[PDB]
A paper describes a structure:
In order to gain insight into the function and the post-translational maturation process of the glycosylated 66.3 kDa protein, three crystal structures were determined that represent different maturation states. These structures demonstrate that the 28 kDa and 40 kDa fragment which have been derived by a proteolytic cleavage remain associated. The core αββα sandwich fold and a cysteine residue at the N-terminus of the 40 kDa fragment (C249) classify the 66.3 kDa protein as a member of the structurally defined N-terminal nucleophile (Ntn) hydrolase superfamily. However, the structural classification of the 66.3 kDa protein as an Ntn hydrolase implies a hydrolytic activity on a kind of non-peptide amide bond as commonly observed for Ntn hydrolases.
Superposition of the three refined structures of the 66.3 kDa protein reveals only slight variations in the overall conformation. The major difference between the three structures concerns a linker peptide of about ten amino acids N-terminal of C249. The most significant difference concerns the peptide bond connecting residues S248 and C249. Upon cleavage, the conformation of S248 and C249 changes significantly. The cleavage is additionally accompanied by slight changes of the torsion angles of the adjacent residue S248, which is within the allowed region of a left-handed α-helix before and in the core β-strand region of the Ramachandran plot after the cleavage. Based on these observations, we assume that the processing step which gives rise to the 28 kDa and 40 kDa fragments starts with a cleavage between S248 and C249. All functional Ntn hydrolases known so far are activated by autocatalytic cleavage.
Author numbering:
A (entry chain A), B (entry chain A): 61 to 239, 245 to 594
Write the structure that this text describes.
Amino acid sequence: PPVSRTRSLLLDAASGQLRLEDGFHPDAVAWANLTNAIRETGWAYLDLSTNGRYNDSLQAYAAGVVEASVSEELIYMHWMNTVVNYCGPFEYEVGYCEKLKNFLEANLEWMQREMELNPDSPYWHQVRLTLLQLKGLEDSYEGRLTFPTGRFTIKPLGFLLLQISGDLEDLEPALNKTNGSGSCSALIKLLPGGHDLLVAHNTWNSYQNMLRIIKKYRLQFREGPQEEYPLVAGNNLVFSSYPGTIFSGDDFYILGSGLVTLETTIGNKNPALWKYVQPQGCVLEWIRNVVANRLALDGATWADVFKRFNSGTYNNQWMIVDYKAFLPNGPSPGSRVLTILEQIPGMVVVADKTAELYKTTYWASYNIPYFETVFNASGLQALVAQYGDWFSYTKNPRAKIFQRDQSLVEDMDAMVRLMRYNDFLHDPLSLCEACNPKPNAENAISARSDLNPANGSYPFQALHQRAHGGIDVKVTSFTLAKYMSMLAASGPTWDQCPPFQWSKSPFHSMLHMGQPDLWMFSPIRVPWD
Amino acid sequence: PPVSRTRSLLLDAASGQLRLEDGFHPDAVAWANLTNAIRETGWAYLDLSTNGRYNDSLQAYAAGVVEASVSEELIYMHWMNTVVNYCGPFEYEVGYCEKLKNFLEANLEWMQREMELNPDSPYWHQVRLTLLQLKGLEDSYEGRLTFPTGRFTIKPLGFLLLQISGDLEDLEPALNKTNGSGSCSALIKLLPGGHDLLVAHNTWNSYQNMLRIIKKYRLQFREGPQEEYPLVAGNNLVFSSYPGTIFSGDDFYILGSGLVTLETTIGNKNPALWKYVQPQGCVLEWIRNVVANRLALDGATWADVFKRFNSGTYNNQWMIVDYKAFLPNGPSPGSRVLTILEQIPGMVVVADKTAELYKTTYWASYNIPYFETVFNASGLQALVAQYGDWFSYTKNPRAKIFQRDQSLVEDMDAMVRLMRYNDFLHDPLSLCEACNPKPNAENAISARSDLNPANGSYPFQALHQRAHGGIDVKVTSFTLAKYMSMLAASGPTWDQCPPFQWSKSPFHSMLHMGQPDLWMFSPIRVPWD
Ligand SMILES: *[C@@H]1O[C@H](CO)[C@@H](O[C@@H]2O[C@H](CO)[C@@H](O[C@@H]3O[C@H](CO)[C@@H](O)[C@H](O)[C@@H]3O)[C@H](O)[C@H]2NC(C)=O)[C@H](O)[C@H]1NC(C)=O
Ligand SMILES: *[C@@H]1O[C@H](CO)[C@@H](O[C@@H]2O[C@H](CO)[C@@H](O[C@@H]3O[C@H](CO)[C@@H](O)[C@H](O)[C@@H]3O)[C@H](O)[C@H]2NC(C)=O)[C@H](O)[C@H]1NC(C)=O
Ligand SMILES: *[C@@H]1O[C@H](CO)[C@@H](O)[C@H](O)[C@H]1NC(C)=O
Ligand SMILES: *[C@@H]1O[C@H](CO)[C@@H](O)[C@H](O)[C@H]1NC(C)=O
Ligand SMILES: *[C@@H]1O[C@H](CO)[C@@H](O)[C@H](O)[C@H]1NC(C)=O
Ligand SMILES: *[C@@H]1O[C@H](CO)[C@@H](O)[C@H](O)[C@H]1NC(C)=O
Ligand SMILES: *[C@@H]1O[C@H](CO)[C@@H](O)[C@H](O)[C@H]1NC(C)=O
Ligand SMILES: *[C@@H]1O[C@H](CO)[C@@H](O)[C@H](O)[C@H]1NC(C)=O
Ligand code: NA
Ligand code: NA
């Protein structure tokens, strides 16, 4: 991309068509601004806004159009790095790809019918806006605008598999594809004397996904299809994202409603549960994620909306922090501050864990579900019995590191240092006994899988050498959320581990267009470089 | 790939299935051996052989299978560099891609019907073998073998657009796609006192296509479907090729029948001729190319076979040199040594130019058709009148360079030096008067378009700065053809121009997996590094 690029989408009355322009224009349906600083900071920055004098449907479709236009090259590169050959005209597993094509077409169609049968329903109005935005993104990148007034078709293997990237980790085993992760860590820390409440997230992902865009949507959507509806509470939102992906993905959101939402992927290892993964009655996580962010005021409200049409795909522990319920220096309000939701196929458990947050002064998060029920139901007891405390909730490497180091986070920088922490060679809690060598780079808060020897003896895939591990840290406070801001550090950890460099890594061969060769980037404050 | 890899395909009687093995196995249907030396020489080397105790159909299908298995990674990389996003799920020109999908499906189906209606015909037996080999290549790469006994389907946008790469330059304008080249130069030189006859070719192509494989097929096909048929004359053939592409492409072949075939793309700039480009009655050039190579004994025989079902796609001047007709040190046989064929939509002209070769002692080739008729019919007179002698047959930059330098080629090395020649800064014949600056890197025998300034004033696209130009030189003599050998130099010219390096070029951004960064490779003799 350029250093900075600005686009606007106007409803041209000379033709009744939508067309793109360059620069800010006040009466445009939507306008976007992408600042690329991936070379200097490891982040691109996108500020997107829609005009509230047009209907939500047009606003939404436009929001996709303007985003795609400012971020063309990044979308191309990210596509080329991540999901370019996924179910291509060659896929070895021709059985699976047919089943996935059928599942998604049947699913998208089911959503279309629900919209057609429920024109007055807020919830299905919210899904349509989300799907219209994806339509916009795609049509804009394809360079042929066409605003649908009624029913419309979304291409199964287009920009959808940029959104369902997380959902796919559960769809493959559900559809009998033959072929670990850990996938993220999070910390919610209450500071001494209740001075402030810090919430942070660290994405674990493949290093190929390391094209990053911090996105700020300032929208003007309403709760329902009629215009007598009030504007949605979650109209303003800042979040860590990727090119094309119209939602977080790694999952860190700061909403203008005083809500901070984030997750860690708990997954599911019980196959008798894939039967609850269906085309009809299921909405893929990423949409539910968005719809919930948009409508929520409370943590309880958020939970309610996300639960609807649970898909059993992209199975997470969802932390919903409500800063409206947080009083600086005050005591426990007893409720409303922290809500934990956990999802597995056919099961969703919700609880208000405010008392817990205040009693223990923190909430940690990793690949292991909290709720005793979910843990058993997802079939983790067999893995504890087979592989020991690595699958235990309170005894896994990461759980222990938090247990003895979490009290040290006293401010923002202290939080970053912990969330970036990885010293597997010298920390006794990173030792794997079933391994050879014993120390493992997975057994840290910010994983660094590439630094494991390619010829080691490991009990399971998650501990093998991989172009995978922690790839970012995002942190926010009370005051910083009040001002829609965060601290963000891009790339794998280099606090103690040698900084990641593609050239010098055993993965030099893997393609990574637009990615910096060396990753030595420091945290920065948004908004804007 | 590895340094060397060997695969075999056996008809396993324990199941009646085809399965792949590692290493040479004598009773296999087919076996292939790929030696990668792209880092040292710029060439990979493939020796492929089929068993003559099986039927041609199985032999052919197997020949595709074994090739794909030994060259998996190269096929992947070449695909990723060349035609990965061609008519993807995003193509801007959604009108064109639909028309191309329809054209190719209708074309492939037309061929299938012809086979079904002509089970005793040699010609359609030869097409089926070619198509079965493409089927093999694809199915093998997909990892699911399935030998078709009767009718079979070839996927339009699979490994077909690796083969139709040349055909596509004429299909796009024919199907009204909105969106130069020069595309190759060749020299056939008769040495003083008729001591020897040298024939050489230099490909002009995009630098992204610079993954190269010199291929040697040693096949056991018969002329017709019945087994009373004699073995085809062109069973053994060495040629310069690319990963996946089951024919030359750039087009240089040395056949075991004493025939050397090569071309330069003359194209067509008269749109009133695209009407002759049809799904039915047309066979795409690449197949015709193969079929002709396989059946030919004479140059006249070759010409006959290539002419059949002319498609008007991939329009070339075809030089057919028959070393059987060549007598060392002797005088002119009057006929049979050199045959020139030229193709444009709906028109093919053939002639025996032996007398010409002997009278002038050479035959040069460039982007301009020889035959006066073809020149007029393809609409080049308007371009001469509009842009001067750059489109003239005898007065274009390359025609003049041959005219004054061709006598100097006295041996193999002298031939390479000419075919690699490019000194655009200091050669008066590389000066473009309508240009700014005047000297142009296109106006050489081995083009070097990248060395033109990106901010120059050029009259037409062919002279703009491009990641395009001469990318190889292949040379052969009488004695070297007798022993199925050639000299081959990989990469853009560096005799006088600074050697090409992706890193230091204004095209560093373009992806080129498996390609050496710097290109300073010298000529080598095949067979084998
Ligand atoms: C939100 O606002 C947009 C734009 O104001 C509305 O889109 C417009 O919808 C009407 C149909 O309800 C279209 O006008 C009609 O077009 C048809 C087909 O050409 C024609 O038969 C009719 O005579 C009429 O002219 C109009 O083209 C369309 N505008 C665009 C840019 O697509 C939309 O209906 C509003 N609400 C919704 C549900 O999105
Ligand atoms: C060339 O040789 C190959 C291999 O020897 C021949 O392929 C074989 O063709 C026959 C059918 O003509 C197949 O046997 C039949 O299979 C069907 C369907 O399963 C079954 O109904 C019959 O009872 C019979 O068993 C055989 O499977 C097949 N072999 C392979 C490996 O595919 C081929 O026919 C010969 N000629 C041609 C035209 O290619
Ligand atoms: C993009 O737009 C924002 C919105 O005001 C502005 O602050 C910023 O300067 C723009 N980007 C650049 C660097 O041009
Ligand atoms: C997956 O395979 C199981 C057998 O192991 C089968 O019962 C199930 O139907 C398959 N799932 C689907 C619906 O693809
Ligand atoms: C989970 O399963 C174990 C047996 O494997 C059992 O001991 C434990 O009570 C279960 N947890 C609950 C209460 O569901
Ligand atoms: C591949 O096979 C050929 C055929 O004989 C042989 O000469 C060559 O040594 C093999 N390649 C290598 C280097 O293993
Ligand atoms: C291409 O466009 C011309 C008009 O310029 C039209 O006559 C012709 O039918 C088109 N070719 C095809 C068949 O797509
Ligand atoms: C080619 O066309 C030109 C007129 O543009 C004419 O002078 C010339 O004779 C033609 N060549 C032949 C013989 O077809
Ligand atoms: Na995650
Ligand atoms: Na050519």
